[PDB]
């Protein structure tokens, strides 16, 4: 969830290690699209959705 024009956070559960990156969005949808673009490009697209247990976003395989 992104209130207005704020930044959101996204964690990648890569393969063995996990790292965090962030991006800015307007609405939750916006955030997802931006984060997805980046992760898709790379090649990590399985379970790609968000977290509401510390307002982060996440991608797992």
Curated annotation (Swiss-Prot):
Repeat positions for Sequence: 7-61
Subcellular location(s) of the protein: Secreted, Cell wall
Domain of life: Bacteria
Function: Binds to the constant Fc region of IgG with high affinity.
Protein name listed in UniProt: Immunoglobulin G-binding protein G
Lineage: Bacteria, Bacillati, Bacillota, Bacilli, Lactobacillales
Residues of the full protein shown: 292 to 352 of 448
């Amino acid at each position: 969830l992104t209130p207005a024009v704020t930044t959101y956070k996204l964690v990648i559960n890569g393969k063995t290690l996990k790292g965090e990156t962030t991006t800015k969005a307007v609405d939750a949808e916006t955030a997802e699209k931006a984060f997805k673009q980046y992760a898709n490009d790379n090649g990590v697209d399985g379970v790609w959705t968000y977290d509401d247990a510390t307002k982060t976003f996440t991608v797992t395989e």
